[PDB]
């Protein structure tokens, strides 16, 4: 034949750390501590594991087994299972094109912060700057100061009016134009992800070595630093303080379910592609287990890293850790945490390692996020592609750059919130629901347990089988139904989103998966004979 076989992993630890670097990102660092504190406190640990063990782990392991079994991309694997669902592999691609439009610009912000951290005096410390207003009031200033409704801090001014420059846009209506600095930063990032991908899984496992390991070292340094800060016990108390009346609310369980689902990130075909290159007799169980546990515990220690510094901040201000933690989002890291860094000795050091930590946290997850789609299209169009892998990887990277120009405008953050909450999220949950239903109720769970019996030598236990048959599809269905029933009201930076925002996100969300139903109609209209025979060739593998 022309091309006999595909590649594999250079070492077990390389992909073992590659899937972990994929699963570990900013959300583990910030999103989990906040949602853990405001819901139940430490008591949030109980439902977070239940939604993991029952909901998250069977989707992570079921997603990870099919990749190491079929060794096909996100697209070509459906031709071998349920060809009518092949559009899933395309939908994810389109979905990826939306996700890459924002998720990289955050690292662009962290990079603009990193290159601005090389000065002996950090820019967000002092209030004398070209971008600051008269409302700017900092510390090392006159005492007795009282905050005003219109007053703003120099870190808030630095993020708002300088790097983001969001004061130059009135909202989603007029966000123009584009900022060139963040365009250069995101160009450097699209360059650093290019050289970590283009050579295939060889470099993506080697570059992961640095990107996965560094955030843990930085979290250790920031943990020892935050533990020595006075009054840090307030953020730890507010973090672990049990509230058992929260478990009675039906909302916090849905929050934990969505949090663990997105934190593990199954059903996107990334784990499918990472498992596609591996040994056939290699163990899926121990891998998925260890990786998931490492991710969750990483979020757990990230909680301490955040809340020691926020407790020190609530000690420098007056208590009420919910007040300094009021804002949930990048402003917690880029304003609150950063302003807490500027007040500490060796502030240049702790700022550099912090922003570098953020960049390393997003970079590996981006490596894998592109790796699943690139593997999907290369496996779907073999030998018509792979003529050069760097050609296709570059063709994807540049397209993602032009797709991120909408996010690089002055009002880009609004588009970040809109795309993440109202568009990408519900469609990723949706396509993951279609996959969980398709593998269990079409290809069958018994044949899946037989394939696991072939790879591992033994059939999976009844605990996992009963999870794939029932618990997991209802686990995603609960989240999708909860979101569609009551979409949350979006607010960012003293600005409320228009009522039609949900129309736009849905319009962007629906336009991603338009391909799967029209593809089902494509194979339904293409296959001759009776519709039962067409759906028989569609149900039976090829």
């Amino acid at each position, epitope marked *: 034949g022309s091309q006999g076989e595909r590649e594999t992993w250079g070492k077990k630890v390389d992909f073992l750390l590659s899937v972990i670097g994929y699963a570990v990102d900013l959300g583990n660092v910030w999103r989990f501590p906040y949602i853990c504190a405001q819901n139940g406190g430490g008591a949030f640990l109980l439902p977070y594991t239940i939604m993991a063990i029952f909901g998250g782990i069977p989707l992570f392991y079921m997603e990870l087994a099919l990749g190491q079994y079929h060794r096909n991309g996100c697209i070509s694997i459906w031709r071998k299972i349920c060809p009518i669902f092949k559009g899933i592999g395309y939908a994810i691609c389109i979905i990826a094109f939306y996700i890459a439009s924002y998720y990289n610009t955050i690292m662009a912000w962290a990079l603009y912060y990193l290159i601005s951290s090389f000065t002996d005096q950090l820019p967000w410390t002092s209030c004398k700057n070209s971008w600051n207003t008269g409302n700017c009031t900092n510390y090392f200033s006159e005492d007795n100061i009282t905050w005003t*409704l219109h007053s703003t801090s120099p870190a808030e001014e630095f993020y708002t009016r300088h790097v983001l420059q969001i004061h130059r846009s009135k909202g989603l209506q007029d966000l123009g134009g584009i900022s060139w600095q963040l365009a250069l930063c995101i160009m450097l990032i699209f360059t650093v992800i290019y050289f970590s991908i283009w050579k295939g899984v060889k470099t993506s496992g080697k570059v992961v070595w640095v990107t996965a390991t560094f955030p843990y070292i930085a979290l250790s340094v920031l943990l020892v630093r935050g533990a020595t800060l006075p009054g840090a016990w307030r953020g730890v108390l507010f973090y672990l303080k049990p509230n058992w009346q929260k478990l009675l609310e039906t909302g916090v369980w849905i929050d934990a379910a969505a949090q663990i689902f997105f934190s593990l990130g199954p059903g996107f075909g990334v784990l499918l592609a990472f498992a596609s290159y591996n040994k056939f007799n290699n163990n899926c169980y121990q891998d998925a287990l260890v990786t998931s546990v490492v991710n969750c515990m990483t979020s757990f220690v990230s909680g301490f890293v955040i809340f020691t510094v926020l407790g020190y901040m609530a000690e420098m201000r*007056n208590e009420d850790v919910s007040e300094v933690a009021k804002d949930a989002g990048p402003s917690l890291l880029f304003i609150t945490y950063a302003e807490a860094i500027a007040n500490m000795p060796a502030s240049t050091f702790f700022a550099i390692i912090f922003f570098l930590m953020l960049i390393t946290l997003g970079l590996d997850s981006s490596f894998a996020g592109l790796e699943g789609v690139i593997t999907a299209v290369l496996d779907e169009f073999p030998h018509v592609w792979a003529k050069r892998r760097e050609r296709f990887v570059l063709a994807v990277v540049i397209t993602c750059f032009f797709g991120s120009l909408v996010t690089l405008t002055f009002g880009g953050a609004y588009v970040v919130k809109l795309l993440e909450e109202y568009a990408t999220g519900p469609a990723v949950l949706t396509v993951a629901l279609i996959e969980a239903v398709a593998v269990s109720w079409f290809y069958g769970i018994t044949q899946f347990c037989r394939d696991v019996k072939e790879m591992l030598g033994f059939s999976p236990g009844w605990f996992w089988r009963i999870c794939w048959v029932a618990i997991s599809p209802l686990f995603l269905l609960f989240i999708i139904a909860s979101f569609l029933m009551s979409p949350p009201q979006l607010r960012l930076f003293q600005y409320n989103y228009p009522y039609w925002s949900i129309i736009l996100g849905y319009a962007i969300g629906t336009s991603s998966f338009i391909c799967i139903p029209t593809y089902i109609a494509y194979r339904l209209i293409i296959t001759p004979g009776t519709f039962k025979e067409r759906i028989i060739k569609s149900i039976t593998p090829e």
Partner: antibody
Amino acid sequence: EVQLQQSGPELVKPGASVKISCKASGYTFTDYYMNWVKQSHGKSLEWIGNINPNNGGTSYNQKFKGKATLTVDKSSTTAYMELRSLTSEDSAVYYCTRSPVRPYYFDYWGQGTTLTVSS
Amino acid sequence: DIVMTQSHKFMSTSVGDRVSITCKASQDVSTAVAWYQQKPGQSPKLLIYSASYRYTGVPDRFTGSGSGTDFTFTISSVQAEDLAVYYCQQHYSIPRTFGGGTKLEIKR
């Protein structure tokens, strides 16, 4: 010359509603939170809730949730508090007081409003 | 929520005597406490804010101290116009709560 001038006393039958105003002067009205404190006869002070005059952003107390409603008018720089479902417990002296964002304290108070709910 | 507990509902003192009022809170308040003075028939007047600090227009004879759950409001020279009801309040956590109040009666 910061002055908060409230309305006069009110006598209302139980089950009715009542509205009390606050007229702020001597300071920039958009710079500070406006608050209302209920003081029962012989009892201590009780914080009802505040409001942001710029957008009128309301922050209430869980005890007063569904009880008092706060509004604001920037044209006349005047704050309002409305009470529905009046009972004998609602008879008390009410105040409107200015407060900053931080540290949170009541620097200037209104002269007070004596409310009597009876038939 | 937060419970500001004033154990002494009434305290006796004489003109010129040094008087102090204690304020017991629920949890650890750090430095955030406010002392208000309400004269009979008048609206409350802010005296002390954030532990030791004094508000503008407050005479030097009024002081405050303590960092913790317990706080102390101290008056050195008591005058005849110093007769009023004193309150302590925590401004950190929502909602803001007040103590039971301590009515200071003058002995002569």
